Amino acid sequence: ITGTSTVGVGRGVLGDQKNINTTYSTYYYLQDNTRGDGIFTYDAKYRTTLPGSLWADADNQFFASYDAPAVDAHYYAGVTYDYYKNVHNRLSYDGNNAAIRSSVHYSQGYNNAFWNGSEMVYGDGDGQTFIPLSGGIDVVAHELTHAVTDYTAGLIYQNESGAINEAISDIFGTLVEFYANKNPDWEIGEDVYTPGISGDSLRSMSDPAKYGDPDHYSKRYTGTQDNGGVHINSGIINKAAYLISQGGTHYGVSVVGIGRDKLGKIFYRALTQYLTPTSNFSQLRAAAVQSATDLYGSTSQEVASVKQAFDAVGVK
Ligand SMILES: CC(C)C[C@H](NC(=O)[C@H](CC(C)C)NP(=O)(O)CNC(=O)OCc1ccccc1)C(=O)O
Ligand SMILES: [Ca+2]
Ligand SMILES: [Ca+2]
Ligand SMILES: [Ca+2]
Ligand SMILES: [Ca+2]
Ligand SMILES: [Zn+2]
């Protein structure tokens, strides 16, 4: 859409008011011209045909219930773009300011969100297991991060490399949640999962076992479902990442925490410089150790904490 940049206001999934970047040309569109080559939000209209229609509104006010998921997918994708640029100096997912596209209201009662190889897609949930998925900033950043991985390490979505792929998305989705300071935690999907149950979440990084996911390599899923447990074995890496940042004693192994910022720095560098499509857990350990060495020196505390964390979850 060619037109004039403006700013509209709307209400998100959780009922919060926010300003969003729009474009005016007869109608007001969900097109943000301020970030890279743009952020574009589409209406999939309860269908599965993608991307749908670029989102058009007559008055630049998005307070209708149908508007909510579009407001949050659009705003959160801008925050995520900002985190990557400001913290890691990366311009969009491809590092060259590629336009970011998202489609909301996909299918009917769809309990998921995904990156399709080219855009982000968000279900509205069935109203019980989930509310519209774009209302969770960690969900939005998890999605966008699948694009970053695809453009960098290219981790195949199955078995060990696939669980690394999932852990990266959970790790950066949590870092983005802390960055925006939106009631941050080490849990995934809490803001959009089981609207009737308080206190739960989809996965836990602090204690993956809480929901039945492994927190040690010896408890790894060896089966075939979920692409060989990509959403299951990611718990082993999630736990390692939480220990590096926060510290703690796990299975008798003590880790001194080095904080989130450094965790982000070491993970980003492993991702963009050392990981490959087929990397396994043991290769990730080597990658993280080498990144920390590059950044802080072989004899630093940072390197020491990375080794301890991996030894705690039984990776190597
Ligand atoms: C019950 C669901 C939410 C759990 C799980 N999905 C998830 O954990 C998150 C959403 C979550 C952060 C809210 N979605 P995802 O990005 O991991 C699903 N992606 C996904 O399955 O991607 C594979 C794919 C490749 C190419 C084209 C299309 C799809 C799953 O698919 O098993
Ligand atoms: Ca309107
Ligand atoms: Ca939170
Ligand atoms: Ca969270
Ligand atoms: Ca809940
Ligand atoms: Zn994922």
From Swiss-Prot:
Residues at the catalytic site: 143, 231
Single Gene Ontology MF annotation: metalloendopeptidase activity
Keyword Isomerase applies: no
One GO BP: proteolysis
Residues at which Ca(2+) 2 binds: 138, 177, 185, 187, 190
Catalytic activity: Preferential cleavage: Xaa-|-Leu > Xaa-|-Phe
Residues annotated for Ca(2+) 3 binding in this entry: 177, 183, 185, 190
Keyword Hydrolase recorded: yes
Record's keyword terms, sorted: Calcium, Hydrolase, Metal-binding, Metalloprotease, Protease, Secreted, Signal, Zinc, Zymogen
Sequence positions that bind Ca(2+) 1: 57, 59, 61
Cell location: Secreted
List of residues binding Ca(2+) 4: 193-194, 197, 200
Primary location: secreted
Gene Ontology cellular-component annotations: extracellular region
Family: Belongs to the peptidase M4 family.
Protein's job: Extracellular zinc metalloprotease.
Name used for this protein in its record: Thermolysin
Organism for this UniProt entry: Bacillus thermoproteolyticus
Lineage: Bacteria, Bacillati, Bacillota, Bacilli, Bacillales
Gene expressing this chain: npr
